[PDB]
Every structure is written in C-alpha cells, then in structure tokens.
Amino acid sequence: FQEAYPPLCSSDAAMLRTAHAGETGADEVHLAQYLIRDASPLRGCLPL
Amino acid sequence: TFIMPMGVFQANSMDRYTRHAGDFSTVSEQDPRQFPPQGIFFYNKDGIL
Secondary structure, eight states, X not given: OOOOXXXXXXXXXXXXXXXXXXXXXXXXXXXXXOEEOOOSSOSSOSOO | OOOOOOSOOOOSTTXXXXXXXXXXXXXXXXXXXXXXXXXXXXXXXXXXO
C-alpha cells in the first residue's frame, strides 16, 4: 500500500503520560511540542 | 530487593515542571520545593511512614 503507520510518539516526556495511575496522555499540542497519537495496528497491544 | 534513589536532582529545566499553578503553595515568598531533595519517604511493613 506504500504507507507507514505512526506510533505513539511525542516531543516531550511530560505529556506522554498523565497523573492518574493508569492510562497515558492524550493532549495534542501543549505550547510548541506535540503528541502524535497512536494509529498503528498495535492499538490494544504492547503494554506500556 | 527494593532500590530507591535519594538525592537525585532533575538537571534539565524542562523536567522541573508543575502540572498546575496552585498545587502546593505556602506562605513563604520562596517556594521550598525548588531546592534539591535530601531524603526519601516510604511505607513500613505496617503502613507506617
């Protein structure tokens, strides 16, 4: 198909994870950094 | 076996962030949490700090 699936990546380790003892971060961009949310087929696998 | 770091100071100024503005305020004109930590607190066998 000539395509590449992007993984959960972010330019800051602060917003990669949130403080609730559980799920990870979900903010898109904070000030000038970014967090590209997961779109790969490993959506519900590979525990974090 | 458990391992625990004591005097670690997060050297990068990006890593020294607060999640909100008024999280742990004091009456002091200098916030006494910018200073590098000198101890560590955990729980006992009975849950004592």
